Amino acid sequence: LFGAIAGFLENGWEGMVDGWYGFRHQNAQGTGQAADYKSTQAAIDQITGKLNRLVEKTNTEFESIESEFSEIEHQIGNVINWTKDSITDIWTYQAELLVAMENQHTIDMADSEMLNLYERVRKQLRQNAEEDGKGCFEIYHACDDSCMESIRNNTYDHSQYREEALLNRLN
Amino acid sequence: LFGAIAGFLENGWEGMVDGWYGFRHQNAQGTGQAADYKSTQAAIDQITGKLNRLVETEFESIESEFSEIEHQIGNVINWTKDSITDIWTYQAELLVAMENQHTIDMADSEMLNLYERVRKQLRQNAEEDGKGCFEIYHACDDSCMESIRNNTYDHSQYREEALLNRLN
Amino acid sequence: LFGAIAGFLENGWEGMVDGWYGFRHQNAQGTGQAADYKSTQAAIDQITGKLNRLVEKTNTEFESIESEFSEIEHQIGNVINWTKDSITDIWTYQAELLVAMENQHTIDMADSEMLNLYERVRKQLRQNAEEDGKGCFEIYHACDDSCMESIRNNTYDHSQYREEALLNRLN
Amino acid sequence: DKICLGHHAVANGTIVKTLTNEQEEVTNATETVESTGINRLCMKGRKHKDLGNCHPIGMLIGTPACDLHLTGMWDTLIERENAIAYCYPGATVNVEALRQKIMESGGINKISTGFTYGSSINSAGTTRACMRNGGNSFYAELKWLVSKSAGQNFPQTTNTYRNTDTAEHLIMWGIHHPSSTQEKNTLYGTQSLSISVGSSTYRNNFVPVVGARPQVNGLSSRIDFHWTLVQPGDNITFSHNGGLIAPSRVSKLIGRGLGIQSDAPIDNNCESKCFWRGGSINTRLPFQNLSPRTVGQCPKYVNRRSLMLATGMRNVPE
Amino acid sequence: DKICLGHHAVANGTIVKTLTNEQEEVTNATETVESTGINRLCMKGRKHKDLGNCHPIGMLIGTPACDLHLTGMWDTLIERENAIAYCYPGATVNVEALRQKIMESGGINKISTGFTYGSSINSAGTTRACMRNGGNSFYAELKWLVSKSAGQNFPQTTNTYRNTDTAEHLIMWGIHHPSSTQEKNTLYGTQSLSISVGSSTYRNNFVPVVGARPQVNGLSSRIDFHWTLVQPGDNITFSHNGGLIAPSRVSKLIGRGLGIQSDAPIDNNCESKCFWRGGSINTRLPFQNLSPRTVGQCPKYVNRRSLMLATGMRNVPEL
Amino acid sequence: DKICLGHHAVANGTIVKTLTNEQEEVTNATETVESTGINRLCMKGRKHKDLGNCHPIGMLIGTPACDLHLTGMWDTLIERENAIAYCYPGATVNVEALRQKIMESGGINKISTGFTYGSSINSAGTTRACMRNGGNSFYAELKWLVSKSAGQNFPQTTNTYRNTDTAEHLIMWGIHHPSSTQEKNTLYGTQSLSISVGSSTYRNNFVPVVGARPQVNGLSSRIDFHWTLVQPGDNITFSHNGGLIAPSRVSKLIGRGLGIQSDAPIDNNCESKCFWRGGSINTRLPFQNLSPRTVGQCPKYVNRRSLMLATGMRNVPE
Ligand SMILES: CC(=O)N[C@@H]1[C@@H](O)[C@H](O[C@@H]2O[C@H](CO)[C@H](O)[C@H](O[C@]3(C(=O)O)C[C@H](O)[C@@H](NC(C)=O)[C@H]([C@H](O)[C@H](O)CO)O3)[C@H]2O)[C@@H](CO)O[C@H]1O
Ligand SMILES: *[C@@H]1O[C@H](CO)[C@@H](O[C@@H]2O[C@H](CO)[C@@H](O)[C@H](O)[C@H]2NC(C)=O)[C@H](O)[C@H]1NC(C)=O
Ligand SMILES: CC(=O)N[C@H]1[C@H]([C@H](O)[C@H](O)CO)O[C@@](O)(C(=O)O)C[C@@H]1O
Ligand SMILES: CC(=O)N[C@H]1[C@H]([C@H](O)[C@H](O)CO)O[C@@](O)(C(=O)O)C[C@@H]1O
Ligand SMILES: *[C@@H]1O[C@H](CO)[C@@H](O)[C@H](O)[C@H]1NC(C)=O
Ligand SMILES: *[C@@H]1O[C@H](CO)[C@@H](O)[C@H](O)[C@H]1NC(C)=O
Ligand SMILES: *[C@@H]1O[C@H](CO)[C@@H](O)[C@H](O)[C@H]1NC(C)=O
Ligand SMILES: *[C@@H]1O[C@H](CO)[C@@H](O)[C@H](O)[C@H]1NC(C)=O
Numbered sequence A, C: 001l002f003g004a005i006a007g008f009l010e011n012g013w014e015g016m017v018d019g020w021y022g023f024r025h026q027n028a029q030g031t032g033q034a035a036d037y038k039s040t041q042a043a044i045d046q047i048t049g050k051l052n053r054l055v056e057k058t059n060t061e062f063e064s065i066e067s068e069f070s071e072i073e074h075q076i077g078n079v080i081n082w083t084k085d086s087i088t089d090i091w092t093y094q095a096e097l098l099v100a101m102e103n104q105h106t107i108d109m110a111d112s113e114m115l116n117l118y119e120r121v122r123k124q125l126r127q128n129a130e131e132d133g134k135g136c137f138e139i140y141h142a143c144d145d146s147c148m149e150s151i152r153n154n155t156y157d158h159s160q161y162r163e164e165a166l167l168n169r170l171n
Numbered sequence B: 001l002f003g004a005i006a007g008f009l010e011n012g013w014e015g016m017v018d019g020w021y022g023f024r025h026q027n028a029q030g031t032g033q034a035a036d037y038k039s040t041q042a043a044i045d046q047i048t049g050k051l052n053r054l055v056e057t058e059f060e061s062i063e064s065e066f067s068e069i070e071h072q073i074g075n076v077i078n079w080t081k082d083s084i085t086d087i088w089t090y091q092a093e094l095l096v097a098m099e100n101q102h103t104i105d106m107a108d109s110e111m112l113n114l115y116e117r118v119r120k121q122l123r124q125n126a127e128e129d130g131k132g133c134f135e136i137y138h139a140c141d142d143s144c145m146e147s148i149r150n151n152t153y154d155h156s157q158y159r160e161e162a163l164l165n166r167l168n
Numbered sequence D, F: 001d002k003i004c005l006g007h008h009a010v011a012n013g014t015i016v017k018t019l020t021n022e023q024e025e026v027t028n029a030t031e032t033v034e035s036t037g038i039n040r041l042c043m044k045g046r047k048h049k050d051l052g053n054c055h056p057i058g059m060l061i062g063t064p065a066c067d068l069h070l071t072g073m074w075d076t077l078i079e080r081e082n083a084i085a086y087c088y089p090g091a092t093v094n095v096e097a098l099r100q101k102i103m104e105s106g107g108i109n110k111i112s113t114g115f116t117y118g119s120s121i122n123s124a125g126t127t128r129a130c131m132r133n134g135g136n137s138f139y140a141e142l143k144w145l146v147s148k149s150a151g152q153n154f155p156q157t158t159n160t161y162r163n164t165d166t167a168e169h170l171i172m173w174g175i176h177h178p179s180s181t182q183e184k185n186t187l188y189g190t191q192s193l194s195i196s197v198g199s200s201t202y203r204n205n206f207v208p209v210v211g212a213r214p215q216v217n218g219l220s221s222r223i224d225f226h227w228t229l230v231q232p233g234d235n236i237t238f239s240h241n242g243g244l245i246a247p248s249r250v251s252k253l254i255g256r257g258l259g260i261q262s263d264a265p266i267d268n269n270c271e272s273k274c275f276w277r278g279g280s281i282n283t284r285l286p287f288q289n290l291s292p293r294t295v296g297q298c299p300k301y302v303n304r305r306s307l308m309l310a311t312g313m314r315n316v317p318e
Numbered sequence E: 001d002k003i004c005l006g007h008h009a010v011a012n013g014t015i016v017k018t019l020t021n022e023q024e025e026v027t028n029a030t031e032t033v034e035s036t037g038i039n040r041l042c043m044k045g046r047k048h049k050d051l052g053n054c055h056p057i058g059m060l061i062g063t064p065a066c067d068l069h070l071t072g073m074w075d076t077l078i079e080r081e082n083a084i085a086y087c088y089p090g091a092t093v094n095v096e097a098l099r100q101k102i103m104e105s106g107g108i109n110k111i112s113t114g115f116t117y118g119s120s121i122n123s124a125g126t127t128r129a130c131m132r133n134g135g136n137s138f139y140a141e142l143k144w145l146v147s148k149s150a151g152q153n154f155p156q157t158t159n160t161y162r163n164t165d166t167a168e169h170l171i172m173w174g175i176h177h178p179s180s181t182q183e184k185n186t187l188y189g190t191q192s193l194s195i196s197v198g199s200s201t202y203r204n205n206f207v208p209v210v211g212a213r214p215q216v217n218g219l220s221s222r223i224d225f226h227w228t229l230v231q232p233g234d235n236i237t238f239s240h241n242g243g244l245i246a247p248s249r250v251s252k253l254i255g256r257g258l259g260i261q262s263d264a265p266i267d268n269n270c271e272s273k274c275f276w277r278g279g280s281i282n283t284r285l286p287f288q289n290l291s292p293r294t295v296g297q298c299p300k301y302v303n304r305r306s307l308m309l310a311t312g313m314r315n316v317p318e319l
Helices: A004-008 A037-055 A074-125 A145-152 A162-168 B037-054 B071-121 B142-149 B156-167 C037-054 C076-124 C145-152 C159-169 D056-061 D064-069 D095-103 D181-188 E056-061 E095-104 E181-188 F056-061 F064-069 F095-103 F181-188
Strands: A021-026 A031-035 A129-131 A136-139 B021-027 B030-035 B126-128 B134-136 C021-027 C030-035 C129-131 C136-139 D002-007 D014-016 D024-026 D029-031 D048-050 D076-079 D107-112 D121-125 D127-131 D142-147 D157-162 D169-177 D195-198 D203-206 D222-230 D235-240 D244-247 D249-254 D259-261 D274-276 D308-310 E002-007 E014-016 E024-026 E029-031 E048-050 E076-079 E090-092 E107-112 E127-132 E135-137 E142-144 E157-162 E169-177 E195-198 E203-206 E222-230 E235-240 E244-247 E249-253 E258-261 E295-297 E308-310 F002-007 F014-016 F024-026 F029-031 F048-050 F076-079 F107-112 F121-125 F127-132 F135-137 F142-147 F157-162 F169-177 F195-199 F202-206 F222-230 F235-240 F244-247 F249-253 F258-261 F274-276 F294-297 F308-310
Touching: A004 A074, A004 B071, A021 A037, A021 A074, A021 A145, A031 A145, A037 A074, A074 A136, A074 A145, A074 B071, A074 C076, A074 D002, A074 D024, A074 D308, A074 E095, B021 B037, B021 B071, B021 B142, B030 B142, B037 B071, B037 E308, B071 C076, B071 E002, B071 E024, B071 E308, B071 F095, C021 C037, C021 C076, C021 C145, C030 C145, C037 C076, C076 F002, C076 F024, C076 F308, D014 D308, D056 D064, D056 D095, D056 D169, D056 D222, D076 D095, D095 D259, D142 D169, D142 D181, D203 D222, D222 D235, D235 D244, E014 E308, E056 E095, E056 E169, E076 E095, E090 E095, E095 E249, E095 E258, E142 E169, E222 E235, E235 E244, E258 E295, F014 F308, F056 F064, F056 F095, F056 F169, F056 F222, F064 F127, F076 F095, F095 F258, F142 F169, F142 F181, F157 F244, F195 F222, F202 F222, F222 F235, F235 F244, F258 F294
Parallel strands: D048 D076, D076 D259, E048 E076, E076 E258, E090 E222, F048 F076, F076 F258
Antiparallel strands: A021 A031, A021 D002, A129 A136, A136 D002, B021 B030, B021 E002, B126 B134, B134 E002, C021 C030, C021 F002, C129 C136, C136 F002, D014 D024, D029 D308, D107 D249, D121 D142, D142 D244, D157 D235, D169 D222, D169 D244, D169 D249, D195 D203, D195 D235, E014 E024, E029 E308, E107 E249, E127 E135, E142 E244, E157 E235, E169 E222, E169 E244, E169 E249, E195 E203, E195 E235, F014 F024, F029 F308, F107 F249, F121 F142, F127 F135, F142 F244, F157 F235, F169 F222, F169 F244, F169 F249, F195 F202, F195 F235, F274 F294
C-alpha cells in the first residue's frame, strides 16, 4: 500500500472523467482542472498488460474420456470422476488466487502511480511550495494560469520564482 | 520493501503493547509512549482478511484400503494421487510464502504511512533525524503531544516560533 | 513501483560495475564515482533466496504408467493421456505464473533498494541539500572528496555545514 | 494560491475480491469466468460428420441407420443421443474401447474380404429386424451364413483374409446364439457348433448358445459382436460349423479426428475450437462455468458463478 | 525536544518462509497444516451402519456374517479390515466394481424372485462351510440346486425374474465348480452342464469346471459368483441343468451414501466431514498431512509437517 | 556542486516476462526450464540390469534371448526397443499388468516346481522355432508335454505346485493351440482336451483352439501364456489332458526397483535421479521441456520452450 489513494487523499473526483489522475489548481484567475496524460497512461498500459496475459492461453487438444450417452464401467468411471474433480478443485483454487493476487497488485499499482505524480510535482516545486496533509500544494509565489500549465507540463522553472516564494514562506 | 521496519528504524519496541505502531516523545514534562490505534487496526484487519480466505468438494473412494486392486489401474491411481499431491504441496508452499511476503511488506507499509502523515502534519516545526524521530523545533508539552497523535495539531500556531529556532 | 528506476532516474550507468547501485559526484576537484556496498548486497541477497527456493529439490518418485514400446489398453490409455495433459496444463500455468510473478517482485524490490538509499541520503543531508528531481542532490556548501566519502560512508554530520548551507539556500 | 493532485472516482462502482479484502470496491472490472456459450456445433473450418441416428459402432457393421456413413473422411465426428448401432438384438465386446477408436479417427475405408462359400451355404440370410426399403435385410458388412438346405449340417468351412495394405485393419464378426433348439437345428444342423478365429495377434473360440431370453425387437436370439485389429501383412482365418455371422468387408480407421458427443445442432458458418454437449465455447477468458466435460482446446472449468478482475483503482466517492 | 516512531517487537519470535528468505523472524504466526486429527470415526449427525466383520458383498448373497445387514437405509456405510464375504470357497467376477456400487449406496431393499423348482430337484442344498446356529446352512439369498435323486440327470430347467419396479435391480447368481468328476456326476448327473443367462441387455453362458483328485489341492469345490443389473421392466432368464446357485432374492440399491473403510472405532458425540483409515479429520485449516488417501470434504493432503503463515510484522528485537 | 544517485545498466539486457508486461528488459536473467538432457542412461550408485534384446516377459518363461536374465537383483531395470518375449508364436494374456509387476520389482528368484510326469509322457518336447545355442529347443522354465507314443491319448494328469515360502510366487503356464486337427491327434490323441487350473484364489479352464488347413492361414500352432500369483502357503493344481505347457519353475519377484524403458546407452560414470526414453535429465531447474514421459525423481514437464527469470533489475540504458 502506498500512502495515497485510500489514504492521504480524502476521495476521488467524480468530476474528472478526463483521465485517471489529475490536477486541480486555485489561483487569482479562478480555478481549473486538467488530467495528467503521462500518469494515467502508465497505469492503463499496465492494466491492459494483465489482460493480455490472462487471455494468452494457447492450449492442448483434449479428447473425451467420459461417455455422455452410455455407461462406462464403474471402477474406471470413479477414477475419472475423482481425477476430473480433483483437477477442477486445483483449477478453482488457481483461479480464485489468480484474481485476488492480480487485484491486490492492481489497486496498489494504481495507488503508486498517484504517489509518483505527487512526488513528481513535489520535487519539481522545490522550495517554492509546501504540502498540507491532503494532496495539496500551497504555492507561495503568485501563480499565473500559464505557470500552472507549466507545472503539469513538467516545465516549471522553480528558480524563476524562487526569491518571491522564499520570502513569502518566511514573512 | 518500504524503508521503515528493519530499515531506518534500528529496532522495534518490546515495550509497546497497546498497538503495533506508536509514538514515543521527549519534552519538558518528561517522556511517554502511546500506541497508535488507527494504524494498528489498518494492519490487524488486513491480516484477519488473509485468514478469512484461508478457512473457506465431496470426494469418494478410488483406492481400496483392505483388499487388492487390479494392478494396471492401481498404478494409475498412485501416479495421479502422487501428481496431485505434488501440485497441492507446491501450491501450499507458494501461497504461504507469497502471503508472508505480502504481510511483512504491508506492515512496513502501514508504518511508513504513519511516519508520513506525521511529517506532513509537523509542516515546518520539526525535521527528520533520519532514524525515525522528528526533532520538534518549538516548545511542546503533553497537550501538544496528543495533539500530534490525535492528528489535531495546527502548525501555523507554532510556525513563526519554530522557524526562528531553525535559523539561529 | 517505487519512484526511482525507469522513473525519475533517467537511466542506468553502464559504466558502473562496482556494484548495482552507486553514487556519482561533482565538486571543485572533479567528477568521481563509487558504488554502495550495503544496498547492492541487500538486493543480491534477496535474489539468492529466490534462486535458493527455485531449486527446491524435494521430489516424489514416479514410475512409468505408459509403455513406450508396447501397445496399451485403449480406454485406460485415454484416461492416462487426458490425465497427463491436464497435469501439464497445470504445471505450464504455474511455471509461467511463477516466473511472471517472481519477475515482477524482483524488478520492484530493486526499485525499492534504490529509493531507500535515496531517501537515506536525503535525510543525512538535512537542510544542507535540496533535490533536483532527477536523482541528484544540490549541496549548499563546498564538499571536498573526504566529504563526499563522508556521505557514502554514512558519517556526514550535518550541523557541521548547516550555517554555511542555511545562508546559501537563502542568498 | 494552491495546486492539488487527485484521482478519479465514479458514482456507482464495482466490487472485487482481493487477498486481504473480500469486499473491496474498485471503479471498473471484467469477467474471467465465461458463463454463456453457443447452442451450436460451430464447424466452419472442419470437415465433419454429423452421424445423426448412427452410432459409430454401426459404421463398422453397416446397420441400416448407418448406410450414409459406411466410408468417408472427417477431422471431427459427431455422435448423437438417439444413436442406433444394433438393429438385431445383441452386444459388442469392448464396445467402449472399440467406440473410442472410431471417435478418434479422421475417417474410414472399407475393404472387401472376398470370402466365398460353398453351395451348401446360403450366405444371404436376412431378418424383419433390419429393414432397408420395407424389406427384410441384414447388416451391410456382415453376412448371415445358414445352410442352403434346412436342417442339414452347415458344412465345415474355412475363410481367410489377408491384409496386404500398409496400415492396420479392423475386422468384425458376430457369433449367432439361436433362441431355441428347433431353430439352432434349422439353420446349422444337429452337429456341435464351433467357431475358431485365428490371427497372429488373436486366437479364440466361440460356441453358439441356445437359450430363451426376453424378446427384443420381436426376437429371443441374439448376435454377439467381436473385433480385432489385423496387422499389415497378416492373415486372419475363421473355422466355422455354423453360427458365424462373417464379415463381407473390413474397416480401416484412417487418420486422426475429434469425437464430439453433443445434443446441439450444426453451424457450418460459426467457427470454434472447444465443445461441450450443449454446443460450443468461443471466449477469450481463461475459465468457464458451463461444463466439466469438454472436448478440444478449452478454458478450464471452475466451480464459481463469477470471478471479477479489477481493471481500475480503488473507488473512493465524494 | 523531539517525537519518535517505532513498531512493537517480541522476545520469543517465530520463523516463517517468504519469497526471499527461508529463515524470517516475525512477531506471530499460525499453522496452515492440521497435523493431528482424531483416531476415532465421528458419526454424529449420520445414520450409519457399521458392518463389523461383515463384508459389503455378503449383504447381497447373505453370508452368516451379514445376517443383520441384508437390508437397510444409511448415509454412511462402514467396512472393516478383514470382513467375510464368502463362507464357501469362491470369488466374484468384477468384485471391485460391485463392492463400490454398494459402498456408494444409501441402502438396500431385498425383493424376492419367487423362483420355484419341479419335484426332481432339491433346492435346500447346504454345506459345512456356511454355518448358522453352528450347523449346515447356505447363502440366505441363494439356493443350491441338486438332483434330489442322487446320480440322476438334473432336469433341464428354466427360471425368469421380472423387474416390475421403477428402479433397476441387482441380481447375483452362483456357478458351482465341483471338486471331482465323481461328485459332479452325483450332484447333477452325467450329462453336460450348461447355464445360460439372458436379459434384454446381457447374455452369457457358464460351464462348471470340474477339478480333480484330492480335496487338498487347489482344484476343489468352488462357487464363483456373477451379477448383472436388471433394468426396470426387464426380465432375466436362467436356462440351466446343474451347477447353478440360483438367487432367491434380488437387491435394489437405494439412494446415495458415503462409504468409509476404517478400523477406527465409532464416536457418536462428534461430527466430521472427512475420514481416513485412522479416523476422522476436523480442521478449519485448508491442508493436512495425516493421510494421502481420504474421503469426503477434506483438506488437501500436502507433503509437509509444517507451513507457517505470518500473522504479524517483521521482528527486530533490541540488541 | 553536486551528489548523484544511480544504478547500473548493461550494454544489452535480456528480455523477460512480468505480470504487467512481456518484453520487459533486465540486466541479467536465467533459464527456469531445462531444454538439454544427457543422452545416456546414468547408472552410478545403482545396481542395474540392462536386459538388452531381452524383454521382461521372457525372464519369466526363459526365452533363449533371456537366458542370462532368469534371475538377478537390481535397483533399476532397463528395457529396450525391439525386445524379444517369445520364440514361439503366441502372446500372454493380460501381459501389460505383468510387465509392470516385473518392472516395479527389485529382483527375481526361480523356484523349481518339482513337477513329475508319468511314463506315457514325453516331457522333453522341443521346437525349431526356439533355437538355443544352435539346436532345436524350448522355453527354459516351461515343459512342452506330449504323448510319448505318437497318436495315443495323453493320460489324465495332475500336478500341484505348493508355495511354502513367505512371499507370493508368480507362476506361469502355456496352453498349446494346435494347427490342424490331424496334429492335435498326434501329440495328444483324439480325446477331448481340457485343462483346469486352480488355487484358492484362482480358477479356470482352458481348451486348445485347433487351427485349420494351411500353415500360412491365421489359425496355426501358437502357445498362449497365462499367469497367477500363488500366495504364501497356498497350493496350485493343474489337471490336463495335454495342451498344457507346464512350468518347471515359478518366479518370485523380490523387493522394489525402478523400471526404465530407454533406447539410450548405459553410462556408469554418471549419476542421476530422473530418466526418459532418450537419456537422462540432470538439472537444477524445476521444469523440463524434453519429454512428458519420464520416470524417477523429476522436474515437471511444461509445454514451454523457455521461461526466463530476472536475476537483475530493469535495464534502462541511455
Ligand atoms: C410372441 C410372438 O408371437 N413372437 C415370436 C416370433 O417372433 C418368433 O418368430 C419369429 O418371428 C420373427 C418376426 O416376424 C421372424 O418372422 C422369424 O423368422 C425370421 C425372421 O424374420 O427373422 C425369418 C427369417 O428368414 C430368418 N432368417 C434367418 C436367416 O434365419 C429368421 C431367423 O430364423 C431367426 O431370426 C433366428 O432364430 O427368422 C420368426 O422365427 C417365434 C419363434 O422365435 O416366437 C414367437 O413367439
Ligand atoms: C500370410 O500369408 C502370406 C501368403 O498368403 C505369407 O506370405 C508368404 O510367405 C511365404 C513364405 O515366405 C510365400 O510362400 C508366400 O508366397 C507369401 N505370400 C505372398 C502372397 O507373398 C505370410 O507369411 C503369412 N503371414 C502370416 C501368417 O504372418
Ligand atoms: C448340497 C450339497 O451337495 N452339499 C453337499 C456338499 C457337496 O457335496 C460338496 O461340497 C461339493 O463338491 O458336501 C458336503 O460334505 C458338505 O459340504 O457338507 C455335504 C453336502 O450336503
Ligand atoms: C513337441 C512337438 O511335437 N514339436 C514338433 C512341432 C510341433 O508339432 C508343431 O510345432 C505344433 O503343431 O513341429 C516341429 O516341426 C517343429 O516345431 O520343429 C517338430 C516338433 O518336434
Ligand atoms: C471500463 O472498462 C471498459 C472495457 O475494459 C473500458 O472501455 C472503459 O474505458 C473502462 N472505464 C474506465 C474509464 O476505466
Ligand atoms: C417380461 O415378462 C412379461 C411376463 O411374461 C412379458 O409380458 C414381457 O413380454 C417380458 N418383457 C420382455 C422384454 O420380453
Ligand atoms: C498470535 O496469534 C496466535 C494465533 O493467531 C494467538 O494464539 C496469539 O494469542 C497471538 N499472539 C500474539 C498477539 O503474539
Ligand atoms: C497344501 O497341501 C498341504 C498338504 O498337501 C496342506 O498342508 C496345505 O493345507 C495345502 N494348502 C492349501 C492352501 O490347500
